[PDB]
Amino acid sequence: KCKYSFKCVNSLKEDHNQPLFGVQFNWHSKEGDPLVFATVGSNRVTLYECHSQGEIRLLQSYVDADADENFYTCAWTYDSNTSHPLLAVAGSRGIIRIINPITMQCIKHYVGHGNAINELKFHPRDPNLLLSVSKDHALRLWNIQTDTLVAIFGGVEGHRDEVLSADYDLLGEKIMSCGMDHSLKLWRINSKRMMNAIKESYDYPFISQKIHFPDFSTRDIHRNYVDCVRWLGDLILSKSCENAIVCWKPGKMEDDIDKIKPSESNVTILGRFDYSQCDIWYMRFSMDFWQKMLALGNQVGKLYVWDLEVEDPHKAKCTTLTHHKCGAAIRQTSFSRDSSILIAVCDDASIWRWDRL
């Protein structure tokens, strides 16, 4: 059974009063440095520092020049040469902005997606490799050191509708993506082709790889849109509108993830994490760094947490986190690197701080 417990220590509301769709703690900050997180919503990116006694200290605010931009996602990285932190943000305009989080100014931008960007993810080993997933049915891999588009994952056997989410595995060898077409697709980036394309992007009109075929595809996990996917080791966690996060794997029970053939037609369900009132799309789940906790907010302000070290997903459920004043949809949550703080962000521009007891 789960033993994790949390106390709500603070909340605030951003004055724009627009929904907050993303929240990310900076996991690159070194041990001892202040815990910082970014929120995104409206045409804004806001940074906060966590201090003792629940204090949430406003650091800086970035307001996009375009008043009609609606940011949907953000992700942290660092400059591999100077160790300086960096933040990537994107949304409805389909433009990626690289922001200097110390000065809160935009450094540069990437255009190319034909529609909105639903998620940004940085590679876990190479801080220059940025993955964007879009309403244009494709994923794109960028090298932000050389400003090149490494690869476009889409086409003949790519997604047939808007891509909602994607995740690199722990070592950054492969990506699982999911979207409106109900499918979950695997894209290996440790192939000889992709490793060479990444190397060529460092040597650099650069020619992008056009990856038309995924290494695995399934529409047999969910019966509707798949709006969130994360790797859990070699297994996958994904959700649709069934009020459940499904833990599954490509192939049969004993099939090795690295021996799965691209035409593999089987999938194996290992378990389900059940919850309530979260059957509308655009609701993300998150995990802590060590992947010992899983968190998901619902449409009425409840925050569910599960202990991933408890095998049975029913016994894994922690006490649901609720506050009588937190009644709006929790779009995304983020744990600090050490798992001591869990922040939730809402449709009513509110931010909620929960400290682990």
Binding site: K30, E31, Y78, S83, H84, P85, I102, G233, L270
Partner: peptide, 29 residues
């Protein structure tokens, strides 16, 4: 088990990332 084997892969792989992070000194925002 499938669970214990998967947890061990997560433990080993997150430990590799944690050691890479420990070796870094990213400037505070």
């Amino acid at each position: 088990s499938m669970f214990s084997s998967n947890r061990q892969k997560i433990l080993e792989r997150t430990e590799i990332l944690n050691q890479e992070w420990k070796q870094r000194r990213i400037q505070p925002v």
